[PDB]
Amino acid sequence: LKMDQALLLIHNELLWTNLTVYWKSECCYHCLFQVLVNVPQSPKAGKPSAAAASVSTQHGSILQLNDTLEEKEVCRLEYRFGEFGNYSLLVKNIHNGVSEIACDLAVNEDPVDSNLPVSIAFLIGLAVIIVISFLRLLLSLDDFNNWISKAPPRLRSVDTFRGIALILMVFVNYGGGKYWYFKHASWNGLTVADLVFPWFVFIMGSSIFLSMTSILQRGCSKFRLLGKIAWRSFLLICIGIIIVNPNYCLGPLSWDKVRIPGVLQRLGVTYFVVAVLELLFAKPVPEHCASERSCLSLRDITSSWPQWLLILVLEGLWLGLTFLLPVPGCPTGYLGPGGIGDFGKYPNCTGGAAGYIDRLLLGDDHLYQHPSSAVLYHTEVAYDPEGILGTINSIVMAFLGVQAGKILLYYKARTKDILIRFTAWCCILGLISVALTKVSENEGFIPVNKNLWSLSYVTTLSSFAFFILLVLYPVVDVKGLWTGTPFFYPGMNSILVYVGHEVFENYFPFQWKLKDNQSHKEHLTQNIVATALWVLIAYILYRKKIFWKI
Amino acid sequence: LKMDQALLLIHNELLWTNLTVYWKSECCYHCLFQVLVNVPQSPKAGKPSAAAASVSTQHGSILQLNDTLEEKEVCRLEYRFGEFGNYSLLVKNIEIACDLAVNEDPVDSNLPVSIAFLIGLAVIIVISFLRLLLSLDDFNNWISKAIPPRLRSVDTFRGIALILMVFVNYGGGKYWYFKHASWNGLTVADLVFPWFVFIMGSSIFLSMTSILQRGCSKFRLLGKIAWRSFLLICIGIIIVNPNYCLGPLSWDKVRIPGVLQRLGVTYFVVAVLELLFAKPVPEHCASERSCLSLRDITSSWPQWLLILVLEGLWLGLTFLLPVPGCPTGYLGPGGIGDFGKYPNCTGGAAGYIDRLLLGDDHLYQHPSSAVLYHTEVAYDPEGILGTINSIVMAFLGVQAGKILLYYKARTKDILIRFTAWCCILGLISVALTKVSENEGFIPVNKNLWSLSYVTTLSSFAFFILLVLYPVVDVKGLWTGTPFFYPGMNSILVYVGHEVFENYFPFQWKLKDNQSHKEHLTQNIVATALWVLIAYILYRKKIFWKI
Ligand SMILES: CC(C)(COP(=O)(O)OP(=O)(O)OC[C@H]1O[C@@H](n2cnc3c(N)ncnc32)[C@H](O)[C@@H]1OP(=O)(O)O)[C@@H](O)C(=O)NCCC(=O)NCCS
Ligand SMILES: CC(C)(COP(=O)(O)OP(=O)(O)OC[C@H]1O[C@@H](n2cnc3c(N)ncnc32)[C@H](O)[C@@H]1OP(=O)(O)O)[C@@H](O)C(=O)NCCC(=O)NCCS
Ligand SMILES: *[C@@H]1O[C@H](CO)[C@@H](O)[C@H](O)[C@H]1NC(C)=O
Ligand SMILES: *[C@@H]1O[C@H](CO)[C@@H](O)[C@H](O)[C@H]1NC(C)=O
Ligand SMILES: *[C@@H]1O[C@H](CO)[C@@H](O)[C@H](O)[C@H]1NC(C)=O
Ligand SMILES: *[C@@H]1O[C@H](CO)[C@@H](O)[C@H](O)[C@H]1NC(C)=O
Ligand SMILES: *[C@@H]1O[C@H](CO)[C@@H](O)[C@H](O)[C@H]1NC(C)=O
Ligand SMILES: *[C@@H]1O[C@H](CO)[C@@H](O)[C@H](O)[C@H]1NC(C)=O
Ligand SMILES: *[C@@H]1O[C@H](CO)[C@@H](O)[C@H](O)[C@H]1NC(C)=O
């Protein structure tokens, strides 16, 4: 059995009734019952005929056994299979009247625990093991030296947040233990991997405001800063396209089969747009007079009214292009995954208008040929999560990060003001997300979606980032209870860490040949070791004062 | 027809004699005639039976048409086939001699591709670079308007070696002369590594004496040497040697030896040796020429003694160590080479030592002789036995550094020493290899890192330094402009081009993958882009050093 899969032997003892087994996962919102296996009728009385099936055990399993001769629901089962199980399913008619048919599912080999076979126990064990190995290696280095023979201040809270995002990104990009909740969700919903990129955009906006206002406060011509912004955005886009997006293990790059969009292209476009907007509408930062007061003081909001107006116009444009753009052969306002999703009536509608804009402007060949929904909804079209339409919400979230930077640097004298603004913004964005999503995964007006970069996705992740900053500012900056240790070294070497881990995805320290690739524990420990090694590399570069920028 | 292939239509008009075609290249010294195609008989008179065979057109082709019924020769053809030819071969009974004819004229693939196309491509690249530089500058101007020191000769030589290495590692147009030679002789790709070791030794002496003249203790320098060797070995093992496009690394199949492992081991050996036997550089005034002062050798007598002992050990292990199932003193390539009577003897003593110590799995699974001599076993060119000769060549580079540092004031002394050492090593190499590959006591061999190989390329490096010291350093007629930029970022360029072997600026999809012109253009563009990256880092004063 493969990893995250369970055996299922269906024993059909029905003499004169054929069966076919339809399997649909629980995460499928509106999903077609994909066929699983066909179990023929029993050739002789008392001798059932069986078939072997491998039902996925990532999350939930709905089985419908339909008679093939007459398509009627013989029986249904809603059971959550466990990894590496047996699950001998017997389909038979009750002997009381030989009319009612009931299928009972019994387990013979107990499931091999996957999600919680490791837990904090194995986590702390691996941490202790790697710490002991690091200490032994450090001591051995001293043995080969002495025992061989006689012989504008940086915040560090934004750095800690960026380091947390980088650690999560390195963990989930390498596989995240191949766990289903450490990878991007299949279309709708929120997972651990979906939190990383919006937090990076938020932190990018905050750092945009911080660096821009510091540069303008010391002194610089706005044309020089505009040139720096354009050069950095161009470098980010080019780095993405050249070294970050393509998978060069498959062959040389092709002029007609290159993925133009990507994480760094979206970051560069967002950087250019929001940084140029803020530089054009740039005002000096006032020094706050009162302390722990001025609740109605909205200077950081009212003083940026042109930026807010343009951001609201952009968001309205995104909403209009999403809920109103006429997509050929597709319902207007489509937010579904296509394929077998939404009952399979729109197989080639992955993304709706957001994906249609990409497939119309950048071409189908220049998109992401393996979207997150391809494994669950079996979508056949290429959808790029970092598309053109989602760049609007990327810009909106970058400007929300800029607003966080405005909050944190306008009220730099008073900490209570910063905390009040942070909690007010977090509450406002959380209320907006609750209104949009109706605290539901697949329901609501605009459900959370990384692939579409939905408005509610942006608001939810911005509320999460505001809460993270609320709990990271007094702890790290003001009170200094915890100078975030395993985080701020990547927080200062983010670009180099990202570029390296993309370039060095498959290298010996970061991944090696496993005893069994169909194991969650081995993949988890390998990914944790790789993330720890990247943190160690960032710490080493910090100790050597090597900080790559731009 | 693949690249470097030629079609051959063998028409068999003979009625009562079957024929088999045996093809052997001209580069092979003693190779078994590998089969090409068995041509059936002609069913009727005037209706020959034809078969199509693709003969390699890289260099030479010896065809032996034996009668498979009785194993007898009828006609032999020592013909040099041209690329993408037709080459209908007709066998007709006269005498039983057969004659060969050409139907489609072959493409030159050498003259038209690398005679004036090189100049054209250089002009196009220069025009494109200037246009790119001016367009960005004009756009910025339009918007703004509206609103001791390094030698540099060792650096130039290192940059030349780096450009050649980048060109030949990327493929070099998939040409046979830009690839590593098949177990003997010299090609353009066989010159980079020994020159790199020579420059490594020269820079070793330069840096050691520059640090020691500042009063730094020998222990700190020894620690730096050890750390640099360790870093080089680890980088070579992890980043450079393995191909990660095939899968994750496994300890069972990982290539322990390599270019950087050999460089690190030789660096540690020669640097520690010359640090232990370090002497201050004397001041030199004299007059005109020193007339064979020989101070740089009388002061290096014990390092020279240890190097000669190492060379004697290399010779003894190569020519005396009994390899089981293999003749003592074997230098051949195995496989079908040496008449195919030693199918698994690639390297002889050196390969046997590699397989005995590091194991068969931890070697180079694709030796350079695999394509031509059909070797089935794994041999590592950067093995263990060849490390002795790599150390010897690093010490020859150290000797060149001593030459160019002891007689710093007198340039005539440096030139005399360089030409004398080049002549001595050239005569030694001529005696060893008899100026003929595959013959002589020790033929020139990169895979074995032969003593004649070391002496030949050390004479080459001494001549290059002789022609680069006055021009670049003393006379100043040249500054090594396209070469000394990688001369300061050698390690960065090597590591990057190993990491970025297949990346868009350096590698892209080709319209005709089986074409020398397109591969040559892509490799030249990639090499020029690496030179441009080195120049950009030079402008930014970014010089990564271990
Ligand atoms: C693209 C990326 C490098 C941008 O990072 P940033 O948040 O803009 O951080 P940088 O260090 O790049 O900051 C650039 C500017 O901000 C400044 N800055 C950064 N953090 C700061 C802080 N906490 N306080 C003040 N200034 C700060 C820098 O000093 C520089 O300004 P200067 O020119 O005056 O020195 C970063 O988001 C990244 O690495 N992303 C990885 C890709 C990704 O998002 N992947 C997720 C999908 S898998
Ligand atoms: C070994 C390698 C790292 C370069 O080593 P090198 O030739 O010793 O050059 P480096 O530039 O590393 O030298 C280091 C020191 O040499 C000294 N040095 C180098 N060139 C010098 C010169 N021209 N004049 C004076 N001193 C010089 C300096 O002191 C320099 O700095 P440090 O002392 O502060 O370290 C590597 O790039 C190399 O030579 N080859 C790798 C590629 C290869 O072998 N390819 C084969 C393809 S088959
Ligand atoms: C399924 O069973 C029915 C009767 O129960 C039979 O007619 C049909 O042929 C079967 N289908 C198969 C064996 O594919
Ligand atoms: C199974 O049979 C039921 C009958 O009620 C039908 O509604 C359902 O669509 C069938 N499943 C499939 C996959 O056709
Ligand atoms: C499941 O159980 C049955 C009997 O209980 C056994 O024959 C089968 O081998 C088991 N599955 C696996 C994968 O071993
Ligand atoms: C959906 O797109 C695929 C190509 O990806 C095509 O083969 C198929 O016919 C399309 N189906 C519909 C219903 O448009
Ligand atoms: C071809 O025939 C000749 C006849 O003497 C023989 O020597 C030679 O070995 C044959 N070729 C091969 C490959 O055996
Ligand atoms: C020649 O080869 C052919 C194969 O096509 C075979 O049939 C024939 O018998 C051979 N002639 C001999 C062996 O004399
Ligand atoms: C070689 O020439 C013959 C006739 O001259 C032709 O039929 C054949 O196609 C040619 N070879 C190729 C590879 O085209």
Short mmCIF file of C-alpha atoms in Angstrom, two decimals, chain A residues 143-295:
data_model
loop_
_atom_site.label_atom_id
_atom_site.label_comp_id
_atom_site.label_asym_id
_atom_site.label_seq_id
_atom_site.Cartn_x
_atom_site.Cartn_y
_atom_site.Cartn_z
CA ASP A 143 38.82 18.48 19.44
CA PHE A 144 40.48 18.86 16.02
CA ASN A 145 41.82 22.31 17.01
CA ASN A 146 42.85 22.14 20.69
CA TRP A 147 42.87 18.39 21.40
CA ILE A 148 44.46 17.39 18.08
CA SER A 149 48.00 17.78 19.47
CA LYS A 150 50.01 19.73 22.02
CA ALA A 151 50.56 22.59 19.53
CA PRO A 152 16.63 53.43 11.95
CA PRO A 153 17.18 50.22 13.94
CA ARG A 154 15.72 47.00 12.61
CA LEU A 155 12.52 45.87 14.31
CA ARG A 156 13.27 42.13 14.79
CA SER A 157 9.50 41.64 15.23
CA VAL A 158 8.89 41.87 11.49
CA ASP A 159 12.08 39.80 11.24
CA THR A 160 10.63 37.17 13.59
CA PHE A 161 7.37 37.06 11.62
CA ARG A 162 9.26 36.71 8.34
CA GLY A 163 11.41 33.98 9.88
CA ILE A 164 8.33 32.06 11.01
CA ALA A 165 6.97 32.38 7.48
CA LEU A 166 10.30 31.21 6.04
CA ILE A 167 10.49 28.19 8.34
CA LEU A 168 6.93 27.21 7.43
CA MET A 169 7.70 27.73 3.73
CA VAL A 170 10.85 25.59 3.85
CA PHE A 171 8.96 22.87 5.72
CA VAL A 172 5.93 22.77 3.41
CA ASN A 173 7.77 23.31 0.10
CA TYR A 174 10.03 20.32 0.77
CA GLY A 175 6.93 18.20 1.39
CA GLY A 176 5.95 18.92 4.98
CA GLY A 177 6.15 15.23 5.80
CA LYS A 178 3.83 14.57 2.83
CA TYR A 179 0.95 15.33 5.21
CA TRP A 180 -2.24 16.60 3.62
CA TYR A 181 -2.46 19.59 5.99
CA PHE A 182 1.13 20.70 5.28
CA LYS A 183 0.42 21.28 1.57
CA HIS A 184 -1.81 23.71 -0.29
CA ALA A 185 -5.49 22.88 0.04
CA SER A 186 -7.33 21.54 -2.99
CA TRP A 187 -9.02 24.81 -4.04
CA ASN A 188 -11.14 26.08 -1.12
CA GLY A 189 -10.14 26.07 2.53
CA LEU A 190 -7.10 27.00 4.58
CA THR A 191 -4.13 24.80 5.49
CA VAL A 192 -0.72 25.37 7.06
CA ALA A 193 0.98 25.86 3.68
CA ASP A 194 -1.62 28.42 2.57
CA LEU A 195 -0.65 30.80 5.39
CA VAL A 196 2.91 31.41 4.16
CA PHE A 197 2.67 33.49 0.98
CA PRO A 198 0.05 36.00 2.25
CA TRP A 199 2.18 36.52 5.36
CA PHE A 200 5.16 37.14 3.08
CA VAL A 201 3.16 39.74 1.14
CA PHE A 202 2.02 41.38 4.39
CA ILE A 203 5.59 41.52 5.71
CA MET A 204 6.77 42.80 2.33
CA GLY A 205 4.31 45.68 2.56
CA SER A 206 5.32 46.48 6.14
CA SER A 207 9.00 46.47 5.17
CA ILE A 208 8.15 48.56 2.10
CA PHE A 209 6.72 51.29 4.30
CA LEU A 210 9.51 51.03 6.87
CA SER A 211 12.36 51.21 4.35
CA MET A 212 10.66 53.87 2.22
CA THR A 213 9.99 56.19 5.14
CA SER A 214 13.46 55.67 6.62
CA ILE A 215 15.10 56.44 3.27
CA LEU A 216 12.96 59.55 2.84
CA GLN A 217 13.62 60.66 6.43
CA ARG A 218 17.41 60.49 6.11
CA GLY A 219 17.34 61.84 2.57
CA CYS A 220 16.88 60.75 -1.04
CA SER A 221 15.37 61.94 -4.30
CA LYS A 222 12.06 60.20 -4.96
CA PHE A 223 13.28 59.47 -8.50
CA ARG A 224 16.26 57.54 -7.10
CA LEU A 225 13.96 55.55 -4.81
CA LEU A 226 11.63 54.92 -7.76
CA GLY A 227 14.58 53.62 -9.76
CA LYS A 228 15.56 51.34 -6.88
CA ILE A 229 11.97 50.06 -6.62
CA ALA A 230 11.78 49.38 -10.36
CA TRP A 231 15.18 47.65 -10.39
CA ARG A 232 14.32 45.47 -7.39
CA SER A 233 10.93 44.51 -8.85
CA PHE A 234 12.51 43.68 -12.21
CA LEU A 235 15.17 41.57 -10.48
CA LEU A 236 12.51 39.73 -8.46
CA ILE A 237 10.47 38.98 -11.59
CA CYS A 238 13.55 37.84 -13.54
CA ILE A 239 14.81 35.69 -10.65
CA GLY A 240 11.40 34.06 -10.41
CA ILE A 241 11.11 33.34 -14.13
CA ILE A 242 14.69 32.15 -14.54
CA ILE A 243 15.72 30.22 -11.43
CA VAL A 244 12.60 29.83 -9.25
CA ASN A 245 9.71 28.72 -11.48
CA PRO A 246 11.15 26.17 -13.95
CA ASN A 247 11.91 22.59 -12.99
CA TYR A 248 15.23 22.09 -14.76
CA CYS A 249 15.46 18.39 -13.88
CA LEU A 250 13.00 17.72 -16.73
CA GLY A 251 15.07 19.42 -19.43
CA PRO A 252 16.09 22.76 -20.93
CA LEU A 253 13.74 25.71 -20.79
CA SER A 254 11.40 26.28 -23.74
CA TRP A 255 10.31 29.66 -25.07
CA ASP A 256 6.74 28.36 -25.48
CA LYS A 257 6.44 26.21 -22.32
CA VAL A 258 7.72 28.54 -19.59
CA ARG A 259 5.61 29.49 -16.57
CA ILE A 260 5.52 33.30 -16.58
CA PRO A 261 3.56 33.76 -13.31
CA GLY A 262 4.97 32.64 -10.00
CA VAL A 263 5.60 33.53 -6.38
CA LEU A 264 8.47 35.94 -7.07
CA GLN A 265 6.82 37.45 -10.15
CA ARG A 266 3.73 38.20 -8.07
CA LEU A 267 5.94 39.58 -5.30
CA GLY A 268 7.80 41.81 -7.76
CA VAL A 269 4.64 43.14 -9.42
CA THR A 270 3.04 43.76 -6.02
CA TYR A 271 6.22 45.44 -4.77
CA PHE A 272 6.37 47.74 -7.79
CA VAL A 273 2.69 48.69 -7.67
CA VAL A 274 2.33 49.32 -3.95
CA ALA A 275 5.80 50.84 -3.46
CA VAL A 276 5.32 53.27 -6.35
CA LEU A 277 1.85 54.12 -5.05
CA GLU A 278 3.22 54.83 -1.56
CA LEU A 279 6.21 56.76 -2.92
CA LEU A 280 3.94 58.94 -5.05
CA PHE A 281 1.63 59.50 -2.07
CA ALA A 282 4.46 59.85 0.45
CA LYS A 283 4.04 62.06 3.52
CA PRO A 284 6.30 62.65 6.53
CA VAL A 285 5.60 60.56 9.63
CA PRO A 286 4.34 62.76 12.49
CA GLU A 287 5.58 62.35 16.05
CA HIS A 288 2.76 61.40 18.41
CA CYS A 289 2.14 63.75 21.33
CA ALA A 290 -0.28 61.91 23.62
CA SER A 291 0.42 58.49 25.11
CA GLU A 292 -2.01 55.59 25.65
CA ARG A 293 -4.82 57.75 24.25
CA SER A 294 -6.21 59.23 21.00
CA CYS A 295 -8.52 56.36 20.09
#
